């Protein structure tokens, strides 16, 4: 029993990681092939001011860039940006490229980041993606390019990228598409988040896995329908619940619906009365669905 | 800039993990050269029972073993036990075998838990070493033989492997001599943990990783002496102070003392009642000092 926050094995993802340098600016990279993708902001002149991207490319020096994993040596062949990221063609092919895809997350979606310092991964811890496209992480100065990952059906996904932290804190990135999550601009100005929603789906597995671990005393016989919850939860920051289906093995197992557990949420939202739940004193969003059932059956 | 409970990469530590399955027991293993280490139960007839361990040994055929992982298939040689932990000798050499050492951690310490289901591994994440001998992790059927590890100035040290959980959800294991923490037997009856004692290093890290996320409320300018303070500890369960050199960089750094951090942890257990430090409801004893520079500051990695 028990329920941590976890991150899926990183190991096939650290070969992967290079350190990038150009100027005084120093981040992260991902190798694949003969290709390395970094955040493009490595080649401003100054992060600390509004930066015309377009003027930087068209004057970049490609042997002004420092590229290394340990002591193999990559020199850039070409530069060109993919949305808010570099592509660099190098003159070596990653002999240690694992077979990847590419995708995005959504919100309430979890997913691991391997934290990386000016070149050498230090760190992995799992996150989920919030309604406004941010992660509530651990990133400093020497940490873009830090990258996210997920582990799916035996094959390996890149998903995020590390560009930027909003002045509420939370963490910023983009997938390897060079689209930023929520759309927010690789610059140095004032950018603010709209109000958080509360995954829903993710309050119920945390929920569920409340009474796997034989903690019951919040839950009751009495349900709430779909259509009820969803119009509260439209008034109360909650997302809307579109299926029961994600939760069918937990349901069964348990014996609960998720009718019983919505019903819970709306009350449990007026506050716990001083208790705690698997030790949080509030609702907790951060565990999917999936990352209950792995953790408590092993699947 | 955020704070969150991590651990070290494992890719060094994956390729140590198989399955070791004996009877109707599944679990993990940590190969090592020609050596396989795991939990002794595996070889148990009955594991919700007493075990008389060193008759069920004699009984064992090393032929019924089943040790793999993908694509390779390890033969059990010979075995023996040492402490809570059988020894197996296997026919195969493994060839991504780390440079390693062995080690024991103490209460108030981090390190690294990969948890592994019957041979796979499947997640890591960051624990604490409890001042019972214990963890709160998440552990069940199938992860015995799960191992811990920290990374220490270039160097692998294996310094945990898992065994049991007791009646409150604690969980226990061994260091990699067999020698189980905290005294635990490798047996289903039930056990105590006795009362946990906070770690104070690692609340003073907390608090001073908070003032440096800009969350300030919970502190004044007052302060209270070591030896006061640890006078209160002793009755309060948390460990004595011996002193203040691990926090000189952190005190420069944010303008608090660990004096005036240790008046806010005894205001502070009373409650926080309704407030949070960096999301926090109360007092977490998670974070060494160490842990707290590295992600604020990025360099100490090991
Ligand atoms: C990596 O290059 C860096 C990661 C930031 C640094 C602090 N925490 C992070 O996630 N990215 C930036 O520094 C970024 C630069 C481009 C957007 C031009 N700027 C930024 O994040 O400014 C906000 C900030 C900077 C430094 C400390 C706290 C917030
Ligand atoms: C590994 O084989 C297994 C891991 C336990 C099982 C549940 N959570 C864990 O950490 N170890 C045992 O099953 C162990 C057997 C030996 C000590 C003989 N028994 C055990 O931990 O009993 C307590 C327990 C069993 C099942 C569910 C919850 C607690």
Redesign the interface.
């Known amino acids: 029993?028990?329920?941590?926050?976890?991150?899926?094995?990183?190991?096939?993802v650290?070969?992967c990681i290079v350190r990038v340098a150009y100027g005084n600016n120093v981040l992260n990279g991902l190798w694949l092939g003969d290709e390395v993708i970094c955040p493009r902001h490595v080649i401003a002149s100054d992060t600390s001011r509004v930066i015309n991207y377009e003027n930087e490319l068209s004057s970049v020096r490609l042997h002004n860039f420092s590229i290394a994993k340990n002591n193999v040596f990559l020199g850039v062949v070409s530069a060109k940006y993919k949305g808010v990221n570099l592509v660099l063609k190098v003159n070596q092919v990653n002999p240690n490229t694992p077979e990847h895809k590419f995708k995005s997350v959504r919100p309430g979606e979890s997913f691991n980041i391997?934290?990386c310092?000016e070149g050498?991964?230090?760190?992995?811890?799992?996150?989920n993606m919030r309604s406004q496209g941010t992660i509530?992480?651990?990133?400093?100065?020497?940490?873009c390019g830090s990258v996210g990952y997920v582990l799916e059906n035996g094959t390996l996904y890149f998903v995020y990228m590390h560009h930027l932290?909003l002045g509420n804190?939370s963490?910023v990135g983009s997938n390897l598409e060079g689209e930023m999550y929520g759309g927010y601009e690789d610059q140095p100005s004032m950018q603010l988040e709209g109000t958080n929603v509360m995954s829903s789906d993710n309050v119920v597995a945390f929920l569920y896995a409340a009474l796997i671990?034989g903690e019951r005393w919040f839950v009751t016989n009495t349900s709430m329908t779909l259509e009820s919850y969803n119009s509260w939860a439209k008034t109360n920051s909650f997302t809307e619940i579109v299926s029961t289906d994600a939760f069918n093995m937990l349901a069964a197992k348990t014996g609960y619906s998720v009718e019983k557990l919505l019903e819970c949420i709306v009350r449990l939202n007026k506050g716990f009365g001083g208790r705690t739940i698997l030790s949080?004193?509030?609702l907790c969003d951060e565990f999917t669905p999936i990352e209950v059932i792995?953790?408590?059956?092993?699947?």
């Open positions: 029993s028990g329920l941590r926050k976890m991150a899926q094995p990183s190991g096939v650290e070969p391997l934290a310092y050498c991964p230090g760190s992995v811890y799992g996150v509530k992480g651990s990133f400093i100065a020497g940490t932290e804190g963490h671990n949080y004193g509030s792995r953790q408590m059956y092993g699947v």
